[PDB]
Design a protein around this nucleic acid. Sequence first.
DNA 1: TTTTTTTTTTTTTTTT
Lengths: 271, 258, 275, 274, 271, 261
Amino acid sequence: DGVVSALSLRERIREHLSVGLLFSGCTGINDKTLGARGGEVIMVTSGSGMGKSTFVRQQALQWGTAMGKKVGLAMLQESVEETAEDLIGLHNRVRLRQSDSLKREIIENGKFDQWFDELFGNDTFHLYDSTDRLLAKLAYMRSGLGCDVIILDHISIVVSRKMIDNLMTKLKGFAKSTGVVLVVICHLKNPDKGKAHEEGRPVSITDLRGSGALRQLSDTIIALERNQQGDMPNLVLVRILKCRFTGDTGIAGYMEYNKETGWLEPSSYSG
Amino acid sequence: GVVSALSLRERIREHLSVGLLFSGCTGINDKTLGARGGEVIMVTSGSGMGKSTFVRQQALQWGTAMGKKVGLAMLQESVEETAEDLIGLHNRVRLRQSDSLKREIIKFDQWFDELFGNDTFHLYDRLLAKLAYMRSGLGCDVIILDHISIVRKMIDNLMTKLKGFAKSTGVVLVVICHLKNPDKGKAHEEGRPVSITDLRGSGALRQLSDTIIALERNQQGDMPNLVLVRILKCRFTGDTGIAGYMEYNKETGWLEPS
Amino acid sequence: DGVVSALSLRERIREHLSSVGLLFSGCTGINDKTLGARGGEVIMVTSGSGMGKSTFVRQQALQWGTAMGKKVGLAMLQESVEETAEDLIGLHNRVRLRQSDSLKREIIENGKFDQWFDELFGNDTFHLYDSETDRLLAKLAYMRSGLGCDVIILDHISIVVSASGESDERKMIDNLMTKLKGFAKSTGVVLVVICHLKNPDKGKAHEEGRPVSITDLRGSGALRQLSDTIIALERNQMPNLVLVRILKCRFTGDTGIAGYMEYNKETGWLEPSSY
Amino acid sequence: GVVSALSLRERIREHLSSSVGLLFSGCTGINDKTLGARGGEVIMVTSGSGMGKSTFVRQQALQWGTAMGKKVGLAMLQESVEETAEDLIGLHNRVRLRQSDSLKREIIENGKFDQWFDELFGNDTFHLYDSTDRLLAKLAYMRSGLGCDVIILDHISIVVSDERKMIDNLMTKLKGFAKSTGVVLVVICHLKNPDKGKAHEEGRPVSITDLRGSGALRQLSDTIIALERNQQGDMPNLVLVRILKCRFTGDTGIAGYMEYNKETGWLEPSSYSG
Amino acid sequence: GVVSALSLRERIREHLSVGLLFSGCTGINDKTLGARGGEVIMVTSGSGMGKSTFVRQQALQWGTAMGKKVGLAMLQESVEETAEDLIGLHNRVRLRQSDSLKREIIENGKFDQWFDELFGNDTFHLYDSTDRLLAKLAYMRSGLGCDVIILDHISIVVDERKMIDNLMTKLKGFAKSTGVVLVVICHLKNPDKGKAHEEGRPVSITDLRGSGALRQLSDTIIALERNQQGDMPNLVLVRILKCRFTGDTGIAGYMEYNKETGWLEPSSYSG
Amino acid sequence: GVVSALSLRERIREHLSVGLLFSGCTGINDKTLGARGGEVIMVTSGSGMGKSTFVRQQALQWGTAMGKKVGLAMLQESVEETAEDLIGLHNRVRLRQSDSLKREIIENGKFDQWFDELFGNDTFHLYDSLAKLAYMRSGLGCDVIILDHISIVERKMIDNLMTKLKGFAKSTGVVLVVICHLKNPAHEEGRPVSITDLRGSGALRQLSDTIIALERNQQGDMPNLVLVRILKCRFTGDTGIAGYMEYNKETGWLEPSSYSG
DNA sequence: TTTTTTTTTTTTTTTT
Ligand SMILES: Cc1cn([C@H]2C[C@H](O)[C@@H](COP(=O)(O)OP(=O)(O)OP(=O)(O)O)O2)c(=O)[nH]c1=O
Ligand SMILES: Cc1cn([C@H]2C[C@H](O)[C@@H](COP(=O)(O)OP(=O)(O)OP(=O)(O)O)O2)c(=O)[nH]c1=O
Ligand SMILES: Cc1cn([C@H]2C[C@H](O)[C@@H](COP(=O)(O)OP(=O)(O)OP(=O)(O)O)O2)c(=O)[nH]c1=O
Ligand SMILES: Cc1cn([C@H]2C[C@H](O)[C@@H](COP(=O)(O)OP(=O)(O)OP(=O)(O)O)O2)c(=O)[nH]c1=O
Ligand SMILES: Cc1cn([C@H]2C[C@H](O)[C@@H](COP(=O)(O)OP(=O)(O)OP(=O)(O)O)O2)c(=O)[nH]c1=O
Ligand SMILES: [Mg+2]
Ligand SMILES: [Mg+2]
Ligand SMILES: [Mg+2]
Ligand SMILES: [Mg+2]
Ligand SMILES: [Mg+2]
């Protein structure tokens, strides 16, 4: 029997309480959800063309340089060279992959190796090269590397309803046991009336494909909106949908994109 | 049954002129008349409506004012977290969010032993054998089971087993499950009224229970701290519908009516 | 184990950012925003019915098989191999060969047929295809591996999701699309996809100049999530002034109205307009 | 099976001098921007409920059967076999046969019925079907077995009776039966209910997405012809022909006008200008 | 069984060797030419405008005056009510609206004077209350050998769009190649703006509620209109909406309702 | 299942062996003349405009005054509440609205002076609030059955319910009076309700043999003035105004009036 | 053989 009375728990609470990881850009988030904590499963939601991976790659950068924590990326959507070059271009403030005038410049100038060890000289970042296999690799990332942040790029091609229920229960048990700060990306569904999500429609908590337990086992959900064919396609609206630790949800802040650099930077906007 | 008018003279005379009670929005036990022995109680709402917080408040008010043994089954979190939340709820402090106070109080043992000087509560980290042990060797009068979605026919057999166990013992039992995904319109998190159809797994959950309580609030709205409570079923009374209103009282954490 | 650390990955990046392009034709704004087609992308071209979603594709296939020397493969499933190989001859020779009976017999008589056939198909560049979703991908691999095609065009994806009998069609489109994207990322071939648009709810039709949204892709929601460029064509039947909409650019961020084209009922080329 | 385009020197040649259109009747504005009807060319005809589809297609079947020598097979599902046969006889002899018991009793006693019958069905040009995968099997029995040049189907809404997947599979099968076989295939479908305003039978101009059953009917059809008239208005015999889709040429819009004959049943090209 | 045109040399000659005339108004018979074997006739109006009474009158006229066997399937009311209505409306009275007159006809033995004169030559068949309907109608048309089959209030028989569509397809297939006039009664949906169908709204063809299969499979469509709130609640208007044999639609004529004998007579009111 | 006309030799005479009247306003029996077996009477007004005030009054005048075995199936409340509603309505007092009178009537022995005069001869029946309404007719024998508040009792369900209740009325010899409501707009100011102001679907008016609408202008000059309008009558055809009735606030009753309108 | 969850396409039924 593993039943424990309330009296014989005095030390286990006293040792227990002896904020967490903050966000970068849209500074109303950590003002609202008080940042991520060890043992949380986070969902990032938008449509295609909104820049979910662009948002999460900045968080991968800022939690590996300023915080020094062991950050493990899981780019199931793309290759490791593309995300490595995007990290180099984001840290070095100048857009790398989306320009050809500089790709041949910085390789013959000799400062490629200068930019490489400036950000990968530590043992911080760990990439993944493309269910049971993925979870065994995450267990190796947790044991054999000591990762503190794990980012998972795309969950829909992980499924070739119950296969998402089993996956989300297994991921929640993994984050409960190991206590790793986890970010998991999923997409939105197709609405049947009115505008789509990509033209400035506010996203409700229903809009989760595949199954319905994506909102039942995750600890917080961040959504991003932006009128794509609009008067400005740069201003994003960030919306907290759920928070089990604080509870306060809604519209948090507003960011612009800064097309030369690529940094999601906060913008003042009354309404 | 078909009601005739032959043997119904002395019953109607009773119509002109309970057990454990519920705390907060007091038209619960004014309407369904509290908790009774041998019942199976369901509190089902949307994801994030405060099911666990409401049953945590009721587990507080059924263990101190009544003194009865309270056996929890919090298979969603750990035993220290729900204990810190109960200590902060008794001490009127949002504990697990106030980071400076957590190291300021460590009077910590003073607030611990004040509410745990008895052997009242019994937490938990097969499961029916554990519940039978909590019922026989410990004298529990309230048993709460928070998560049952991972614990059709695989849920129906478990519900038959729980209903037979409750009828055989005679203990107050509260079991929590979630709601299904609505198809058209808004969701339950934006003010949609919950019907008895919306229960995941199967349909025996409404046929083998005794009362169902639902909560609805506008989570993406102006007031995310104003629920509406709805009784959906009560085999003893029958009075269903709107019960009351609770605001969360952010500073403290007590669901208080207004 | 494939958990490659970020420090021991320099050389690969050394052979990555030195060794892109392959510009479109007919319009300039398509090459400004999307910056051409790349090895390993999926470019999707959408329209209504009879709106010219194959004419722009063949006008792009002629420029990418002759003016740049790339080997091009055509999985055309609407049209047989006898018509789409006959439209290209008159297009390069700037006429409408299929829509005219006189010019057909004129190039029969004087012997100009062999001259026009050898000027176009004198180089081993265009590899066609004629017409169950399992053998099509094997034929695409047979085109890419041995023959070595750079731009492969999958015309009319709706036939392999409709003639294939499935109870649930959404998972069929999702699984076909993710296996196709996996093939395109594995072999690194430029891939063009043609799909249709569904029935709208009310109002105008897409064949009457309705401004198309990204959510109107017919069949599933897996079409817009695993494509890298979405380009839409919109006219009003001036039944020849078509506008082009970049609905989703993964690589860059410039989306919106790209440009304007004009179709020629004398030659068959999509010239750019000026408005 | 993949092929290389340098082995195609003998087949593109053979296709180049093989392909000959069948000219429409009733309006010459149809033949100018469609150039007729070819092998492997699914032609859709639609109108409102009872607005003149079967009369038009039966006249087209008469003109393609007795004036151009083309063997024609029909699959009429609305009516009986003897009814459409007597309708063809009465329309070829320029009378109104079935709508008059007096002429039907008149021609059966003086023996001119056999004279009207042998001049049509002497050469054995028409073939009929006696009332869905067995349907295409019998159509291939008609085509590959006998050898008619134009196959007409009517009233496809019986054949599909989740309707959308069924009619999508049916439209793909009919397109595959038309293409790469060598037959013209004529298909008739209906319209759905409108949202607001006036009805399709009261003179509303029909759009392309009004084809009831799916939107998979307008993506696999080559030529789409829509007939529309006002049966309650001042001119209830002035049909308007609207070409909605044309894969071969691309010109869409109003072809012209046709005027139906209240006595002989021959809708003929009128000269009304709006 | 692909049959060529040569094999109909003897069949067409047998097919050349008949419209059943409508009663109540001769304006219907001029632009319909009656009804042949395999001729689906849809009869509609608003709610309570006399769809059952007009079809009951035609069931009377086609049975006792022309010798054609009529098989009714009245589902609005039961068997005894429509039998009393047929007897009272052949004897030109209002039978059910007079308690003393129902009681008198058994005291003087004249009940068999009105039963024998009508129901003796087997010229009628009834039906008491979807594939259990057609299986009995086929027995009504095969073994019994009736000539006009009548179906009342089709909404009892019926997502109710595929159901009414397959029903109308089965009824059309049962009518064709059998040789029977299949009278079918349907209804009309709600109006949207202005006045209602019970106040005399000019009905359109697309108001046949349930599907579009009620206006695309019927050979003849007859609609009735009556302003029961205006000046004359005894003057109905008859509108032919579809005729696949002749091709004339519009106002067929006016019929005057008589509030004494239960009959409606041909009226001569002009607009 | 096929019924010829030869086997109706005596069975039409079997139908010759009668309607059931109405009360309160005499304009109802003038143009409807009652209700036999197989008749459905839809009675409606706005949601809370006094449907049950007239329905239970007719059920009272049919049960204790004309001997007909009235059975209600009130599904808003249980057995005891509507039984005490029948008692307090028959004894002309506002029962469930004042604690003083309910306090005063329980002790002075005027309770069991009221049970044997109404509920003693087992006519009134109720439901334990398909397989039950057949036993309510066969074993019990009650005929005039009322079902209320169909919004708890949105197109397929109401059509299937109305079709099964239509089939329950037919071939039984039973009078099933069903109550429904109106769609939202103002209906509380005397707005003329046509037959199109139903809600749910249009399948209600297709099977309802008789349709009765109730109007009242509770916001004008005299709020206690109501009106009854027949909308659909399949037995006669005469539909329209029954007359005027006046309501009373202190006793809870209504009287037929003849105001000049 | 009997249930539950979930995604995308077309046709008719109703409302502030
Ligand atoms: C946030 C943002 C991104 N962008 C551009 C920059 C990048 O080129 C691109 C980033 O979007 P992606 O991150 O590539 O798209 P996604 O991950 O959200 O969607 P999916 O996985 O389904 O394909 O969008 C803008 O133009 N404006 C913006 O505000
Ligand atoms: C009711 C309410 C709760 N909250 C907080 C309290 C909790 O921390 C959180 C929601 O209550 P929880 O009880 O934690 O939600 P849950 O247990 O039902 O979630 P799950 O379905 O995954 O089991 O939000 C508010 O902030 N405002 C409110 O009005
Ligand atoms: C775009 C365009 C096409 N056309 C003509 C030329 C094209 O050959 C003809 C249609 O040919 P397609 O380009 O093949 O038509 P489509 O691809 O849009 O339709 P489907 O999906 O059925 O294949 O339209 C014009 O006349 N003007 C125009 O602007
Ligand atoms: C077009 C037209 C038809 N008519 C009449 C006479 C024709 O025989 C009749 C058309 O009969 P059909 O052509 O057989 O009917 P349809 O194809 O339009 O529709 P459906 O089969 O679905 O019912 O309409 C005219 O009188 N004038 C006209 O201009
Ligand atoms: C025909 C007609 C009937 N009436 C009266 C007497 C009829 O019995 C009554 C109509 O009853 P029904 O004929 O039964 O009404 P209905 O069949 O058109 O519609 P539903 O079955 O949906 O109710 O109205 C008139 O007042 N004027 C008339 O012109
Ligand atoms: Mg992405
Ligand atoms: Mg919980
Ligand atoms: Mg095309
Ligand atoms: Mg026809
Ligand atoms: Mg009727």
